[PDB]
Design an enzyme around this catalytic site. Structure first.
Site, PDB file in Angstrom:
ATOM      1  N   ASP A 232      -6.788   5.605  17.072  1.00  0.00           N
ATOM      2  CA  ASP A 232      -5.492   6.277  16.901  1.00  0.00           C
ATOM      3  C   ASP A 232      -5.129   6.943  18.229  1.00  0.00           C
ATOM      4  O   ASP A 232      -5.989   7.135  19.088  1.00  0.00           O
ATOM      5  CB  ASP A 232      -5.568   7.408  15.860  1.00  0.00           C
ATOM      6  CG  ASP A 232      -5.620   6.920  14.413  1.00  0.00           C
ATOM      7  OD1 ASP A 232      -5.519   7.791  13.516  1.00  0.00           O
ATOM      8  OD2 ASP A 232      -5.771   5.709  14.151  1.00  0.00           O
ATOM      9  N   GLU A 503      -0.836   9.331   2.841  1.00  0.00           N
ATOM     10  CA  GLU A 503      -0.017   8.154   3.071  1.00  0.00           C
ATOM     11  C   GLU A 503       0.531   7.655   1.733  1.00  0.00           C
ATOM     12  O   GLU A 503      -0.234   7.352   0.806  1.00  0.00           O
ATOM     13  CB  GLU A 503      -0.832   7.082   3.815  1.00  0.00           C
ATOM     14  CG  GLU A 503      -1.234   7.542   5.218  1.00  0.00           C
ATOM     15  CD  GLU A 503      -2.422   6.798   5.780  1.00  0.00           C
ATOM     16  OE1 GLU A 503      -2.524   6.716   7.031  1.00  0.00           O
ATOM     17  OE2 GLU A 503      -3.249   6.295   4.981  1.00  0.00           O
ATOM     18  N   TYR A 615      -6.282  -0.822   5.655  1.00  0.00           N
ATOM     19  CA  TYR A 615      -4.838  -0.673   5.516  1.00  0.00           C
ATOM     20  C   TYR A 615      -4.219  -2.022   5.147  1.00  0.00           C
ATOM     21  O   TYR A 615      -4.726  -3.074   5.551  1.00  0.00           O
ATOM     22  CB  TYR A 615      -4.215  -0.138   6.804  1.00  0.00           C
ATOM     23  CG  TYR A 615      -4.303   1.368   6.973  1.00  0.00           C
ATOM     24  CD1 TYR A 615      -5.498   2.055   6.735  1.00  0.00           C
ATOM     25  CD2 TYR A 615      -3.200   2.101   7.393  1.00  0.00           C
ATOM     26  CE1 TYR A 615      -5.585   3.430   6.906  1.00  0.00           C
ATOM     27  CE2 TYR A 615      -3.276   3.471   7.571  1.00  0.00           C
ATOM     28  CZ  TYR A 615      -4.467   4.134   7.329  1.00  0.00           C
ATOM     29  OH  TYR A 615      -4.536   5.499   7.514  1.00  0.00           O
TER      30      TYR A 615
END
Length: 658
Positions: A232, A503, A615
């Protein structure tokens, strides 16, 4: 050339097969290639597919093997005790197990090249490692080799690393075949790549996939193009997009939706050793976590993502500062000029850089690209490139000039070192993207930006309402536009978690009824409902029957257009596992019209429970198939950083799921 050995239809049922007689006296010279088509849908924890060994007493450590783990990792050992060589090369997450209920045929090509002193491994058309050594050991020059074995390694007369699976085809060559020759070998892949190493992005890594079906039938995808490994921000990351016009069969060469140019777009092989794997690009601005929606009224496609100024990421971002100054109801981007200890500037209307201390406009303006001009003239900065030649990460000037952006390290004027949200639009369905604009702060001057929930925004079917879910501490913060993304307001929805990565993705169950599914810190996916098109939100409930880890994983979700068993259906995509990011599933839920409750009726296993799944993005293709673009590895695990070509796309039909 032609094989020196070819065999097939080998069943490995916890019993090795001896092929010494057929193979060993065929092996000649110091370069070899192994081609192996094999299935393993119920592998043992650790098993060898193929071995060459000295099976004699006292030479337990003289062997070559190709092995796999039930995690999906593939690798080789090359050992010779007399030579004092113990090579072990591997990569996690290199295999498929099952697709649509059927065992997948993996295509493995191992090249051992004495001339270049290099061992290279491909699986399903993907190079998973390429290692050069000082001291090369040919795989059949191991001292006293007397066994060629499938499904184990013969050590001192015993079967080690017993395999469960099958080898449909195996070929060996007394040559190191070229990269070109390798690419001519036919594959039986259950997946395809949309974004991939060496494409137009020149990012060696990708994370955070999205998918969205446009009304023309074009399917659009966005993704983090990550340059400095899979970390990230802080890092270098751009947002890239690609689209399919044939229901997902083929995909366009990627272009950028959002990009910075302070650092070069370099394809780098990021180190995976424990000493250097945490190396992180530390001076680059980046974009991260994108979300997509289509506006019915304008016809525009809208893309949002988080924005990070140079060297900034989630953990060093100034919390308690939006980066904007409120001046009577309006929000202006703050700027700090080279040498000042504080932010004495703002960007007013038409990009005019205004001085706050003296309340004077300056000779500087900010253009549409957030670039700095002086008296109408484009100022520049020098670009950085990264390398590990010194044996550690270095970031240094590369001699190229690029326009000076307020998000950059070397800029004359600099934004607040915090996180923002930006938006861009396409008028041509992703063939080109406009210059991005910062969204305003929604939670006040003294609050850092919320974080965009990656995936899809929601376009309500019975109005022009657009909603992008975002999160921050203590709440979901839905961003709402009723005018094609020109103006936004927020709708806050409290959640019983502090500092979570909540999320969230939305589905419209029926007209104006929105269910949001979100990541938590409890091991269960949560949900909440709005029955007024997102103005107000219910309390939080949780789904039983799906497990996540304590830290959780992004969940993707759509409303299926067709009835299933006569009911309205929703489909969730998520790992199902309390251990790691693995056990990918699509879970089909049927809505109960009495109360809008959902009966999670069908669970479809994407691949083995032990194989990685993180993800994900799902969309209903125009032909009513399901498209799935997903991280096929464990993107949490510290052992699976910086893998290439693990974000993969598959096509499914409803009957596959049920």
């Amino acid at each position: 050339i032609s094989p020196i050995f070819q065999g097939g239809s080998y069943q490995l049922n916890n019993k090795s097969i001896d092929i010494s007689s057929l193979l060993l006296d065929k092996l000649s010279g110091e370069s070899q290639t192994v081609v192996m088509k094999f299935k393993a849908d119920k592998p043992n924890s650790l098993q060898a597919l193929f071995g060459l060994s000295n099976s004699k007493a006292g030479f337990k450590n003289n062997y070559f093997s190709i092995f796999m783990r039930d995690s999906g990792e593939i690798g080789v050992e090359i050992r010779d005790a007399q030579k004092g060589i113990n090579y072990l090369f591997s990569r996690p997450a290199s295999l498929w197990g099952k697709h649509k209920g059927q065992a997948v045929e993996n295509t493995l090509v191992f090249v051992s090249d004495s001339k270049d002193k290099t061992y290279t491994m491909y699986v399903n058309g993907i190079e998973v490692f390429s290692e050069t050594v000082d001291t090369f050991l040919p795989i059949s020059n191991i001292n006293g080799i007397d066994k060629a074995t499938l499904g184990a390694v013969n050590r001192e007369g015993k079967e080690h690393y017993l395999a469960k699976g099958s080898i449909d085809e195996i070929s060996l060559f007394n040559k190191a075949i070229s990269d070109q020759e390798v690419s001519t070998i036919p594959l039986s892949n259950p997946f395809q790549l949309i974004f991939q190493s060496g494409d137009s992005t020149q990012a060696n890594y990708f994370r955070i996939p999205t998918l969205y079906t446009l009304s023309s039938g074009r399917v659009l995808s966005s993704i983090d193009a990550r340059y400095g490994g899979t970390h990230d921000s802080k890092s270098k990351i751009n947002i890239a997009t690609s689209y399919s016009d044939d229901n997902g069969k083929t995909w366009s060469e990627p272009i950028f939706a959002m990009k910075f140019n302070d650092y070069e777009e370099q394809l780098v092989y990021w180190p995976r050793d424990n000493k250097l794997k945490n190396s992180q690009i530390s001076g680059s601005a980046s974009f991260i976590d994108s979300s997509i929606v289509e506006d019915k009224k304008s016809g525009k496609t809208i893309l949002l993502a988080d924005v990070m100024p140079a060297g900034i990421g989630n953990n060093n971002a100034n919390k308690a500062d939006s980066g904007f100054k409120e001046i009577n109801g309006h929000y202006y981007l703050k700027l700090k000029k080279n040498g000042d200890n504080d932010f004495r500037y703002t960007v007013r209307e038409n990009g005019v850089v205004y001085n706050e201390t003296t309340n004077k406009p300056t000779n500087y303006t900010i253009n549409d690209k957030y670039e700095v001009l002086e008296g109408g003239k484009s100022l520049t900065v020098e670009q950085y490139s990264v390398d590990f030649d010194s044996g550690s990460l270095r970031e240094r000037h590369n001699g190229k000039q690029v326009p000076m952006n307020v998000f950059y390290k070397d800029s004359l004027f600099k934004v607040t070192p915090t996180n923002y949200i930006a938006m861009t639009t396409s008028q041509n369905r992703g063939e080109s993207w406009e210059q991005f604009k910062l969204l305003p702060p929604f939670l006040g001057e003294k609050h850092n930006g919320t974080y965009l929930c990656p995936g899809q925004g929601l376009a309500l079917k019975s109005s022009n309402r657009l909603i992008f879910a975002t999160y921050t501490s203590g709440e979901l913060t839905y961003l709402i536009s009723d005018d094609s993304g020109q103006t936004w307001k927020k709708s806050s929805a409290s959640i019983p978690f502090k500092n979570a990565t909540a999320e969230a993705q939305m589905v419209e169950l029926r007209d104006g009824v929105i269910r949001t599914f979100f990541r938590t810190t409890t091991g269960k996916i949560a949900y909440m409902t709005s029955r007024d098109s997102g103005e107000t939100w219910s309390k939080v409930s949780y789904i039983d029957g799906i497990q996540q880890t304590s830290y959780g994983t992004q969940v993707s979700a759509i409303k299926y257009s067709q009835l299933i068993d006569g009911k309205e259906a929703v489909i969730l995509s998520t790992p199902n596992s309390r251990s790691g990011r693995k056990g990918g599933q699509l879970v089909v839920g049927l809505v109960n019209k009495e109360d809008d409750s959902i009966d999670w009726k069908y669970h479809y296993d994407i691949d083995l429970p032990s194989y990685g799944y993180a993800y994900s993005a799902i969309t209903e293709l125009p032909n009513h198939h399901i498209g799935v673009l997903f991280e096929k590895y464990d993107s949490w695990s510290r052992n699976e950083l910086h893998l290439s070509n693990v974000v993969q796309y598959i096509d499914l039909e409803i009957n596959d799921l049920t």
